[PDB]
Design a protein around this ligand. Structure first.
Ligand code: DCA
Ligand code: DCA
Ligand code: DCA
Ligand code: UD1
Ligand code: UD1
Ligand code: UD1
Ligand code: GN1
Ligand code: GN1
Ligand code: GN1
Ligand code: CO
Lengths: 449, 449, 449
């Protein structure tokens, strides 16, 4: 069935004390509004109308969904007024689902439920019963049938007794939406245009309004300040962790795990406490991740073991690799089968071959290292002359002495050996020994200052 | 109005199993007793009388508040006995507020509330209703008026039914305090001098006692063991995090944030999980702090970005600086505008100029580095001859090759260049190339052991 | 009294989605089944019969308890059927305690309680009252006496009202167990052999069954998926932390502490957030551990201070040592009194003498360093020629310049000095200066690319 979504976000987020539009504040790696848009498309929305008031520049820059139709609302004269701005773009024969830009946890399952309950020619309303319904629109019923909504400011004490409140989410036919929206007046407490008035307008037109409730309260919770955002952050993370656990992923402590993106995985993956996954991460079978690790946009093959406190970004590790602790892999880092990177080791645009080892205090940038190569501690690749960056190539079976510096561009033949403390400025022949050492001398009875 | 405070802390903290006085155990960066003293001064206390029994040496060494009058209590013959020791120092025309040295969360707001309720010539008592009032003094009332307090050991079963218990906090006039304190006898269960007896003494003298309740239970919670201390630690941290969130500071996870000191901040500051702030920290606008960072007594300018797992102490970062991950800044570290420090890099008493970069495996100590300077990986400043430490100076536009060691004292002119693997023992001219390299040689068909 | 235990674990752990037997999944550092076995032996079990179905190869490899008698159960025809397999190995005059391999938190105290309640010739049954007893065996009583157990599938609606359910744990006499087990039929809902039928069989034989309840629900909780495992992980950790706090160990945040092994300690030990202890760890008096530290199978002497993010394994630190932050100690690391290891420093099979300092960017492997020695930053020990590893020896009062590489095997006499950037390939005399430096030269007006 034809369906379109409208997201209102033209309200001012004052209690955020931010120079960034409220709906742009991230939650689990993405803008709150982006969460709403995803649910919209995920539900099958044809067009997603976004109503904004200011910061539209940062908005258009942060959001780039193909089916995103921008609707301006200069003045915030009420949710009804806002809906009237987008009304013109409602297809007569399509359904219109209204959503809030600051309610990120709304689920597709519940939205799909609201769609089904929506009577033909009627309205699908999402409501919830709170212990304290203070400050929210009150749902009124006649013989069990929803006949309208009364705002807190307009409701009488007796009416404020009603605990079934309006979440704001509702769905109706485009043509119907337009007919009602046109009849909205601002003769009420707030003195604004209530989108909630359409509920009565539909009831008196003989249309019926059905109410549906969400799975969890957190689903329809709105964010006005940072403390509320942090709260929903925990809910999201807890649900994610929980899904991963039930999905076969072992988390040492779910309360101490954060997923800010997407995580593909194999069987028996084990993740210790305080680990953060960002962007798209792929984990093979039996992957072990120590505590405090940070993995972003990376691929990790089977049986890999990531030791504690290792930062990885845009890297690709083949099977059976072991890196860390205290390893830092930067964009372009590649490790072939059984490769090993020790502590205090950094890799940027570098490839370590099969079984190759970069054990300690080393920096590999812009280099291609063959298989069975051994990089001693202190080895560094000089890939920057202050203006340009150069490549370092090391063939197979190479042994690089510690504290060796390779000045790029340079190539070290296969089976070659580089003495410790060597400065390589020229290519090294295969099966040859490169060296640049001053014979050790000594001075008897040398007293220090 | 004239007011003085008395803090009792002469009791033995046996269940702490510590060689340090109980009240000296830290909470959020400071001694529990120090928390009490702060609330005292913060309330406007003229004099703060501290009653101690032992460990007075460590106490006087840990506490150094100008208005701290030390009152000894050799024997712990009861809270009343303790108060009698300080009684002599009570000004007749001043008010006296009594507090416990092991109840760190008492708030000024509640103490200020207790002050106002205190009737002229009467007493201001702080009380709370517990689900289980077992083990605490029971508040007795006649026609709604507090007429006294009955200790648990002295109370009858029927009286132990009363749930309104004494927290210990009370305020009265100095002169009044002395008159009552003088009449204290130890004819009771414990066989000690109950400070709580003054409540009845005031009632029978025609004085009236008013009761005031605290905002939260945690406010008047006492610490006898380490488990209770940890509990209050969480309360304190949770309240702090919560204030920061509502104040505009974004915390990825409030449950995973610790503030042990003071934190000044700008707008849109973002802090990831497991971050610890110690001492006085100043954060400019839009400052980003990655997970697991530790910042102590430091200043961080606008738009700075602190990558994961970076330790900073007594450092000063100008605007737009980027340090970490895995960076360690020690006392005296200064970074000018746009400075960058990579992973596995340490700075002690060193200044990195504008736009200067210390990317990897580097140690900078006792040095002054100009602007637009580039420090290659492995570079080290030798600032210690085994007895003295020497300074290293590097002018602007300098390029330092990797694995370069500068033996201080040494100066590198502006625009100068130092070849990789160089040992600088002498000054380098401006726009000159410093070098100490052995030409690379080679030996064909070299077989390794 | 004679007692033996039987652990059933032949059930399939499907919802674990693992290639490892469910009972083998670790909890607090050890396999879930291992937890059960420990409680068995800890209670004084003579023989521990383990009933398994598959993965027996990984089981026998993971478990190696002397008194472990393996009992196979090819088909899982019910708990009763399983017990019949081990029945043959029950001593007529000994007691038999039955336990589940997936209920790791069962405590010895509660098991010892169940033993005492067990009537002579009767049965000791452990039961619990749940809010929702759905899916568990229902305990039936006649005049307050347990007369049997009815499984959920067999129980009627009315009977499912009973909230006292069977935990599975029970104890009876071997001879009695055999007599009843022989009479088990599978004429019930599940169509299996219920071990629970012995309860009725005993009742009708005139024997009496007594019921005992556990201290906590978590005690008898079973694990079928990873989410439930994580939950019990938190319970275990919380209880452990709590014991340590009450035992005098200060934990900055108990929720952020993990103990996976055994921890011996002294007085006033202080542990910051996110610290992990693995294997057997010994902590002396006044030991301080910063946040994010990982300590495994190590010994730490009095007054040691472990800075943030330091990984230690099979190391031994004498008194008053200070290591970190960002230090990595590998097997064989030893530090003598007052030794210091800075940031980005790694030690493997190395000994640092008294007062010796390895401050930065250093790697010490296979070395013996005397007292009062100073290792400058960048120093590295070359202990691997690509096939063999060699030892490095440095006598007392030695000063090693920065970025020095010692090629093993090599020995540096006492009081000797090594110039910065030196490559030591030969032994150095005592009180002598070792060097291999190229005089610094310069080239005027050198322009970079
Ligand atoms: C764990 C990390 N370890 C490392 O990084 C250490 C790497 N190893 C080295 O740097 C070693 O000193 C080397 C591989 C260069 C030598 O191996 P080793 O110490 O077992 O053998 P030697 O000391 O007897 O090697 C001497 C050879 O190297 C050459 N050599 C040694 N010092 C110098 C020098 N200053 N200039 C030119 N060649 C030299 C000689 O030509 C000689 O060749 P030959 O065998 O035909 O006489
Ligand atoms: C990413 C981090 N990278 C680094 O740290 C690498 C820093 N770069 C270096 O150390 C480079 O080897 C240098 C800057 C010294 C040379 O630049 P580059 O390799 O592009 O040029 P060249 O190899 O042709 O430089 C040769 C010059 O340096 C000098 N040079 C090279 N090796 C030696 C030596 N052993 N002794 C004395 N001078 C030497 C020569 O006097 C010569 O001068 P000229 O241009 O008048 O003939
Ligand atoms: C904080 C970490 N710091 C470090 O690692 C720095 C360690 N210090 C060094 O490497 C120093 O350069 C040294 C210990 C070698 C020299 O000490 P300092 O700079 O105060 O004294 P000098 O520069 O005047 O030392 C010169 C002596 O060393 C020797 N020396 C200096 N350069 C060389 C060289 N290229 N070849 C041989 N010997 C040399 C000379 O034989 C001379 O001996 P003398 O005193 O009888 O004339
Ligand atoms: C009049 C109305 O609809 N009342 C409902 C609305 O309250 P109420 O209107 O008071 O709520 P808000 O003002 O927060 O508006 C909700 C959303 O609409 C946006 N917005 C608001 C005004 C405007 O002119 N433009 C605009 O885009 C806000 O940015 C926010 O995303 O939500 C409550 C639940 O949260 C319901 O219980 C109320 O019955
Ligand atoms: C007699 C008395 O006052 N009773 C009150 C006291 O109990 P109670 O007297 O039993 O409590 P404590 O012994 O812990 O004393 C409270 C505080 O007084 C200090 N101290 C105690 C005795 C002494 O001789 N010197 C001294 O300095 C302790 O170190 C502690 O800081 O506090 C309870 C709340 O916590 C109240 O409900 C009780 O009504
Ligand atoms: C028939 C029976 O005993 N019923 C009890 C059993 O339920 P129930 O039999 O349904 O429970 P499970 O199937 O999980 O069996 C419990 C334990 O026995 C093992 N196992 C099971 C069958 C088998 O043939 N071999 C085997 O070794 C499982 O691996 C598990 O460790 O435990 C519940 C509590 O958890 C009790 O409330 C039930 O009254
Ligand atoms: C400074 C150095 O070269 N250390 C070597 C050396 O370190 P160990 O920590 O001892 O394993 O042996 C490794 C192979 O076992 C090699 O990969 C590494 O580079
Ligand atoms: C070993 C080395 O000198 N690396 C250089 C080099 O590292 P990259 O990680 O490739 O960016 O370029 C940097 C400037 O882009 C410079 O600051 C740094 O010192
Ligand atoms: C590169 C270097 O050698 N730094 C020295 C030097 O570091 P500082 O951080 O300045 O303390 O003095 C230390 C003794 O105070 C010595 O142990 C260390 O090795
Ligand atoms: Co070097």
């Amino acid at each position: 069935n034809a369906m379109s979504v409208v997201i209102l976000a033209a309200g001012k987020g004052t209690r955020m004390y931010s120079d960034l539009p409220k709906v742009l504040h991230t939650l689990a790696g993405k803008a709150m509004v982006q969460h709403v848009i995803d649910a919209a498309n995920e539900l099958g929305a044809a067009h997603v109308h976004l109503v904004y008031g200011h910061g539209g520049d940062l908005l258009k820059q942060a959001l780039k969904d193909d089916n995103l139709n921008w609707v301006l609302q200069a003045e915030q004269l009420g949710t009804g007024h806002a809906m009237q701005q987008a009304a013109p773009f409602f297809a007569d024969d399509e359904d219109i689902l209204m959503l809030y830009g600051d309610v990120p946890l709304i689920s597709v399952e519940t939205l799909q439920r609201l769609r089904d309950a929506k009577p033909q020619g009627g309205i699908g309303l999402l409501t919830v019963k709170l212990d304290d319904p203070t400050g929210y629109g009150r749902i009124t019923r006649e013989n069990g049938k929803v006949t309208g909504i009364v705002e807190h400011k307009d409701a009488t004490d007796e009416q404020r007794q009603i605990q079934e409140i309006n979440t704001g989410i509702l769905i109706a036919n485009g043509a119907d939406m337009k007919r009602w929206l046109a009849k909205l007046t601002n003769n009420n407490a707030q003195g604004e245009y209530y989108i909630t008035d359409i509920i009565a307008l539909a009831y008196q037109e003989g249309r019926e309004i059905v109410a549906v409730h969400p799975q969890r309260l957190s689903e329809v919770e709105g964010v006005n300040n940072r403390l509320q955002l942090s709260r929903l952050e925990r809910v999201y993370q807890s649900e994610q962790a929980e899904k991963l656990l039930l999905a076969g992923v072992m988390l040492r402590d779910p309360a101490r795990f954060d997923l800010r993106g997407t995580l593909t995985h194999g069987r028996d993956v084990e993740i210790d406490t305080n680990v953060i996954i960002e962007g798209n991460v792929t984990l093979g079978h039996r992957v072990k991740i120590g505590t405090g690790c940070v993995i972003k946009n990376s691929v990790i093959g089977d049986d890999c073991e990531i030791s504690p406190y290792t930062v990885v970004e845009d890297a690709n590790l083949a099977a059976a690799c072991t890196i860390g602790p205290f390893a830092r892999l930067r964009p372009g880092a590649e490790l072939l089968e059984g490769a090993h990177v020790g502590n205090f080791v950094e890799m940027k645009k570098a490839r370590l071959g099969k079984g190759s080892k970069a054990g300690h205090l080393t920096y590999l940038g812009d280099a291609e290292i063959g298989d069975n190569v051994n990089i001693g501690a202190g080895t560094i690749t000089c890939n920057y002359d202050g203006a340009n960056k150069f490549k370092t190539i090391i063939g197979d079976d190479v042994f690089v002495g510690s504290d060796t510096q390779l000045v790029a561009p340079v190539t070290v033949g296969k089976g070659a050996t580089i003495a410790a403390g060597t400065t390589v400025t020229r290519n090294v022949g295969e099966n040859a020994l490169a060296i640049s050492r001053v014979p050790q001398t000594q001075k008897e009875g040398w007293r220090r200052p």
